[PDB]
Structures are given as C-alpha cells and as structure tokens.
Scaffold this active site. Structure first.
Site, short mmCIF file in Angstrom:
data_model
loop_
_atom_site.label_atom_id
_atom_site.label_comp_id
_atom_site.label_asym_id
_atom_site.label_seq_id
_atom_site.Cartn_x
_atom_site.Cartn_y
_atom_site.Cartn_z
N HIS A 1 51.01 40.23 39.74
CA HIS A 1 49.61 39.75 39.76
C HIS A 1 49.55 38.22 39.42
O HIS A 1 48.57 37.60 39.88
CB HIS A 1 48.75 40.74 38.90
CG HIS A 1 48.95 42.24 39.11
ND1 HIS A 1 49.90 42.97 38.43
CD2 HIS A 1 48.31 43.11 39.93
CE1 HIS A 1 49.85 44.23 38.81
NE2 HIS A 1 48.88 44.34 39.73
N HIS B 1 49.83 31.47 32.19
CA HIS B 1 49.85 31.83 33.62
C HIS B 1 48.78 31.03 34.36
O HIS B 1 47.97 30.41 33.71
CB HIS B 1 49.66 33.34 33.79
CG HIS B 1 48.33 33.82 33.35
ND1 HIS B 1 48.10 34.38 32.13
CD2 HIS B 1 47.14 33.83 33.97
CE1 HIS B 1 46.84 34.71 32.03
NE2 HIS B 1 46.24 34.38 33.14
N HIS C 1 45.89 31.06 37.91
CA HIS C 1 45.20 31.69 39.06
C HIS C 1 44.94 30.60 40.12
O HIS C 1 44.50 29.52 39.72
CB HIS C 1 43.89 32.34 38.58
CG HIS C 1 44.03 33.19 37.36
ND1 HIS C 1 44.03 34.56 37.43
CD2 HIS C 1 44.15 32.89 36.05
CE1 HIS C 1 44.16 35.08 36.23
NE2 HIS C 1 44.24 34.08 35.37
N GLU D 1 38.91 30.57 38.32
CA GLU D 1 38.15 31.77 37.95
C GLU D 1 36.78 31.31 37.46
O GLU D 1 35.78 31.70 38.01
CB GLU D 1 39.02 32.51 36.94
CG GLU D 1 40.16 33.19 37.64
CD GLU D 1 40.65 34.42 36.94
OE1 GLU D 1 40.89 34.34 35.76
OE2 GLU D 1 40.76 35.45 37.56
N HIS E 1 45.76 29.42 32.12
CA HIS E 1 45.30 30.21 30.96
C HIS E 1 46.43 30.22 29.93
O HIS E 1 47.44 30.77 30.26
CB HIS E 1 44.96 31.63 31.40
CG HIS E 1 43.68 31.71 32.14
ND1 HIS E 1 43.28 32.82 32.82
CD2 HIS E 1 42.69 30.82 32.26
CE1 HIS E 1 42.12 32.59 33.35
NE2 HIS E 1 41.74 31.41 33.02
N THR F 1 40.42 38.55 32.30
CA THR F 1 39.92 38.50 33.70
C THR F 1 40.72 39.42 34.62
O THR F 1 40.46 39.38 35.82
CB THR F 1 39.91 37.06 34.23
OG1 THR F 1 41.27 36.66 34.30
CG2 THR F 1 39.10 36.14 33.35
N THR F 2 41.59 40.27 34.07
CA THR F 2 42.40 41.28 34.82
C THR F 2 42.43 42.62 34.06
O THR F 2 42.21 42.61 32.86
CB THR F 2 43.85 40.84 35.00
OG1 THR F 2 44.43 40.61 33.72
CG2 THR F 2 43.99 39.61 35.87
#
Ligand SMILES: [Zn+2]
Length: 257
Positions: free
Chosen positions: A61, A91, A93, A103, A116, A195-196
C-alpha cells in the site's frame, strides 16, 4: 482485501471498516480563512539528531522507512501535544500525475505527494496500545511540490529498485530524516484518524504550511513501484491517497497569523 483500485478503493472501505464514516476521519480540506489562529499553541520540538533507521519495506500500500523505537532517540515534543512521541516510521502518498497525490488539500489545492512521519505516545509503552487511545499517535504531514530536487531524498529514491514488489525489504541504515523538513515549522493542527485501514481515530494531525520541492525525476521513481507481489500481474503503485473527509464538529487551529 482493501486497496486503491476501482473495486476495492476508498469508497468500499466502510464495508470492512465501519469507522470510515466516523466523527473524526482524515484527511480533510484545510480552509485557510476558517482556521482559527491560537496563541496558546507552543512551537514544535523535533529531536531527530539520534535517529536510527533500520529498513525500507514495500508493504503493498506504500513503502515505509522503519526506525528503532526501543528508546527516546527520535522524538516529537511541543506544539499541541502533552508528553513525548517516538518516531516509528515514515511513508509517502503520491499521484499518477503532478496535479494530484496529497491526502490533505489547502483551499482545495492538491500537491504532487504527501510525507507522513508517524510517532506514538510513550506513556502507552508500545505502538499497538497507542493506536487504541484518542491521543495515541502524532503524525507530521509535509506537502511535496514538483520543482527543484531535494538532495536529502535521493538516498530513498536510489533504493526503490530493490523493493519494487509487495513484501520486499532492504537494509536502510544511517538515514537522517532532518533532510526532509522545510525551513519553517509553522503548522495546522486538528484531531483525526489513520488515512488507511483500520482507520483508528487516535491521531493528532500536525500539517506544516511550507511544502518541500522535489524534481519530476525523483517523484517519477515513486511511480515505478508495484502494488502486486513478485510473479503476479504488474499493477503500478500510483494514486495511493484517500480523498478529503467531512470536518463534522472539528476546528482546525493554526500556529501562525
Ligand atoms: Zn500516510
């Protein structure tokens, strides 16, 4: 299993995780004219000088850079927090194009990517227990815009070839996360969630106002990773961002006027 595809993406997560439609879900649009300047907010205290990075992992992911969190070596203190928070991983996004990928949004503006840095509250002794508390995690969010290259990110970009597919990991020692910070530490703060999946409502969000610059070449390398495992059909790891969630009964506070 959950993902970012047409049939298992953000709009399907509520079926397996009923907290997806919660009272304090993340990310959110940061209305800069509605945010309340708060003069009681203290400056952020980032102590990453003793940080010890160990590994970089493709988890299917995103890719995570993991740190030794067995001692107070890399800590986040200050701002709207009470107590010490230890860095466990960071990590990103990112998008398929330069016009999307973050995000969070600022007055509906999307950035190319969002970093993040995830920290957990030491009074609860381990990450696993911190995620079950409302003040358990502190995540530092930093927007990425395409423009000049970030010299401090190249070490991360050069190793992506070694962890192309889900489950692959590589030794990643002596990485300094102080190279990814912007000049100013001015920020927005609000109570939110991961957020996951499992989307737990245990995060105090700290979003920096200043974005960092990365080169088209650097972000292009992020887009060559795979969601799939080795020997499986190739699915490029792109557009791994959850869209903005409603603010509901929450107030975004700002550290600057
Ligand atoms: Zn994230």
């Amino acid at each position: 299993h959950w993902g970012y595809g047409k049939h298992n993406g953000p709009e399907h997560w509520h079926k397996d995780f009923p907290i997806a439609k919660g009272e304090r879900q993340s990310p959110v649009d940061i209305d800069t004219h509605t945010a309340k300047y708060d003069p009681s907010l203290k400056p952020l205290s980032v102590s990453y000088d003793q940080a010890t990075s160990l590994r970089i992992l493709n988890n299917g992911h995103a890719f995570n850079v993991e740190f030794d969190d067995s001692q107070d070596k890399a800590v986040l203190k200050g701002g709207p927090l009470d107590g010490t928070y230890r860095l466990i991983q960071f990590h990103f996004h990112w998008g398929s194009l330069d016009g999307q990928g973050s995000e969070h949004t600022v007055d509906k503006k999307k950035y190319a990517a969002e970093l993040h840095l995830v920290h957990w509250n030491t009074k609860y002794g381990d990450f696993g227990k911190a995620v079950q508390q409302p003040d358990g995690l502190a995540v530092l969010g930093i927007f990425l815009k395409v423009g000049s290259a970030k010299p401090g990110l190249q070490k991360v970009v050069d190793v992506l070839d070694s962890i192309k597919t889900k489950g692959k990991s590589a030794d990643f020692t002596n990485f300094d996360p102080r190279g990814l910070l912007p000049e100013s530490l001015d920020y927005w703060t609000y109570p939110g969630s991961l957020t996951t999946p499992p989307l737990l409502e245990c995060v105090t969000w700290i979003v920096l106002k200043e974005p960092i610059s990365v080169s088209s070449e650097q972000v292009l390398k992020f887009r060559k990773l795979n969601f799939n495992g080795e020997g499986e059909p190739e699915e490029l790891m792109v557009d791994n961002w959850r869209p903005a969630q409603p603010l509901k009964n929450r107030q975004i506070k700002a550290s600057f006027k």
